[PDB]
Design an enzyme around this catalytic site. Structure first.
Site, short mmCIF file in Angstrom:
data_model
loop_
_atom_site.label_atom_id
_atom_site.label_comp_id
_atom_site.label_asym_id
_atom_site.label_seq_id
_atom_site.Cartn_x
_atom_site.Cartn_y
_atom_site.Cartn_z
N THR A 142 24.10 65.72 37.21
CA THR A 142 24.98 66.45 36.75
C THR A 142 25.47 67.54 37.59
O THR A 142 26.73 68.33 37.72
CB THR A 142 24.38 67.20 35.39
OG1 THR A 142 23.93 66.17 34.75
CG2 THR A 142 25.45 67.99 34.66
N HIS A 146 13.81 63.31 28.54
CA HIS A 146 13.92 64.45 29.59
C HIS A 146 13.09 65.55 29.30
O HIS A 146 13.66 66.30 28.34
CB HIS A 146 15.30 64.63 29.81
CG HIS A 146 15.51 65.73 30.96
ND1 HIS A 146 16.71 66.62 30.94
CD2 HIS A 146 14.86 66.00 32.00
CE1 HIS A 146 16.77 67.30 31.77
NE2 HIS A 146 15.62 67.08 32.52
O1 LIG Z 1 19.59 68.26 33.48
C1 LIG Z 1 19.95 68.08 34.76
O2 LIG Z 1 21.25 67.73 34.74
C2 LIG Z 1 18.94 67.74 35.71
O3 LIG Z 1 17.90 68.63 35.58
C3 LIG Z 1 18.12 66.51 35.27
O4 LIG Z 1 19.05 65.50 34.70
C4 LIG Z 1 17.44 65.98 36.45
O5 LIG Z 1 18.47 64.94 37.31
C5 LIG Z 1 16.09 65.00 36.13
O6 LIG Z 1 16.38 63.98 35.43
C6 LIG Z 1 15.43 64.61 37.43
O7 LIG Z 1 15.25 65.65 38.69
P1 LIG Z 1 13.82 66.38 38.62
O8 LIG Z 1 12.76 65.23 39.04
O9 LIG Z 1 14.13 67.26 39.75
O10 LIG Z 1 13.62 67.09 37.33
MG LIG Z 2 19.91 63.97 36.12
#
Ligand SMILES: O=C(O)[C@@H](O)[C@@H](O)[C@H](O)[C@@H](O)COP(=O)(O)O
Ligand SMILES: [Mg+2]
Ligand SMILES: O=C(O)[C@@H](O)[C@@H](O)[C@H](O)[C@@H](O)COP(=O)(O)O
Ligand SMILES: [Mg+2]
EC number: 4.1.1.85
Lengths: 213, 215
Positions: free
Chosen positions: A34, A134
Site C-alpha cells: 500500500t 493481518h
Molecule cells: O497495512 C499495510 O499496508 C502494511 O502494513 C501491510 O499490508 C504489510 O504489507 C504486511 O502485510 C507485510 O509487511 P510486514 O511483514 O512488514 O508487516
Molecule cells: Mg501489504
C-alpha cells in the site's frame, strides 16, 4: 506448501528494487505494498510485472469503494491479485471480483482492523476465495502479539472455504504457531527487506515452511 | 456556518484532474485528491495540486488502514492539509496519523463505511479526532441505496458527539434539502461537478443552494 510473498512497502520504486534485485527469485509473490501504491501509484504494478512476469504480482490497494474502477486500474497495470479492505460495502467486493475475472485475476479481502463473521459469510456468498489475516503494524507497535485467538480465527476462515494468507510483522520464529493449518501464503515485509541478509531471510522462511508443511 | 463545498478529484491522472481544477479551483473551498488519483499517480498528486493552489485546503483521500504514521507522513510531506483514515483501522492507526498531522498543522478525518459502531466513534473522539466523513458508497448507490432516514439520524448523532461531519456520496443538487437544519461542515461533490456540461455552473448551483438552505 504455503507460498512466500514479499511485501514491498517502499515509498519509491528504486527503494523497492534494492530488495527485488536480491530476492525476486527467492519468493513466489511480489507485493506492491500500500505504501508503494501511495508513493508511486499504479505504475509500480506495471513496472514490477514487466520485470517479474513469471511471478504473481499482488497490488495491496485496500480498495474501499468504487470497486470496479480501482480494480480495473490495477488489472490494466497487469496485477494478478488485488486487495479489497474488509469494511468495503459488499458491492465493492463484488465489483472488484467481476473485473478480476475479466483479467483472469483474483481478489483478496484484507482483514486489516475491524470486521465481523457475518461479513465473512457475505464474502463467501459473493464468491470471494481469499482473505488476508493481518495483524496491524500499528497494533503490533502498541504491543499486540500473535495469539490463540488469531489461530482460532484463521482456522475458522479456512473451514469456511477461504484460502488464508497470514501476515503482520512475521518473523521466522512465528511460523510454528500456524502449523497444521493449510495456509495459502505467508507474507514477510520487514523481516525480509530489513534483514542483514535478505537472501538468507527468504531462504530460511522457505526452509521452515517446507519442514513444517 | 454554511456548509463548505469540496470537489473530489477521482481521476486516474493529473491531466484529467486539471481539466476540472482549471475550471473550478476558485469555485470550491476544498480540493480533494481522490483515492483513485492517490493510487493512480501517487503522492505527487498532493504535492502538485498544493503547489498550484497553495491558498486552498488540500485533502488527500488516502483512506489509511494501517501504518498510520508512515502513510500520513508521506501525505503531509507532500503538503496535504487533511488526510483520511478508514473507519475499520486499528485505533493506533488513527492516533499515529493524527500525531503526524499535528506536526504539520494538519488534520485527520475518519472515512465512514462498513459496520462501524458507536463505541468506535467514541474511541475516535477520545483519541482527539474531530472530523468524520459520512459516505454513501458509490457501489451501494449503484445497487439502489438511497439517502434516507437512518442517515439523518446517524449524522445528527455524530454531530452531537462533537464531530464536524462531511456528507458525501453521489450527491446531486436535489439531495441537499434532505440535510437542511443540520450543521454539516462540508458537502463533497465529485461526479456532479466533474461530469457536468459546465463544471463551473454546477459548483455555483451547489453554492447557491447551500446559501439558501443554511442562510
Ligand atoms: O497495512 C499495510 O499496508 C502494511 O502494513 C501491510 O499490508 C504489510 O504489507 C504486511 O502485510 C507485510 O509487511 P510486514 O511483514 O512488514 O508487516
Ligand atoms: Mg501489504
Ligand atoms: O470511495 C472513494 O474513493 C470515492 O468514491 C469517494 O471518496 C468520492 O470521492 C466521494 O466522496 C465524492 O465523489 P462522488 O460525488 O462522485 O460520489
Ligand atoms: Mg473521495
Amino acid at each position: 506448501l504455503p507460498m512466500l510473498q514479499v511485501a514491498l512497502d517502499n515509498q519509491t520504486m528504486d527503494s523497492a528494487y534494492e530488495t527485488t534485485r536480491l530476492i525476486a527469485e527467492e519468493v513466489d509473490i511480489i507485493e506492491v505494498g500500500t505504501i508503494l501504491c501511495v508513493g508511486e501509484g499504479v505504475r509500480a504494478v506495471r513496472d514490477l510485472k514487466a520485470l517479474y512476469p513469471h511471478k504473481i504480482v499482488l497490488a495491496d490497494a485496500k480498495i474501499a469503494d468504487a470497486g470496479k474502477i480501482l480494480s480495473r486500474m490495477c488489472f490494466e497495470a497487469n496485477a494478478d491479485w488485488v486487495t479489497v479492505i474488509c469494511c468495503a460495502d459488499i458491492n465493492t467486493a463484488k465489483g472488484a471480483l467481476d473485473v478480476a475475472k475479466e483479467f483472469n485475476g483474483d481478489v483478496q479481502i484484507e482483514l486489516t482492523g475491524y470486521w465481523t463473521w457475518e461479513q465473512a459469510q457475505q464474502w463467501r456468498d459473493a464468491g470471494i476465495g481469499q482473505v488476508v489475516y493481518h495483524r496491524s503494524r500499528d497494533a503490533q507497535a502498541a504491543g499486540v502479539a500473535w495469539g490463540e485467538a488469531d489461530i482460532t480465527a484463521i482456522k475458522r476462515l479456512s473451514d469456511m472455504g477461504f484460502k488464508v494468507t497470514v501476515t503482520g510483522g512475521l518473523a521466522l520464529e512465528d511460523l510454528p504457531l500456524f502449523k497444521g493449518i493449510p495456509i495459502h501464503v505467508f507474507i514477510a515485509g520487514r523481516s525480509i527487506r530489513d534483514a542483514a541478509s535478505p537472501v538468507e531471510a527468504a531462504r530460511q522462511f522457505k526452509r521452515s515452511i517446507a519442514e513444517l508443511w
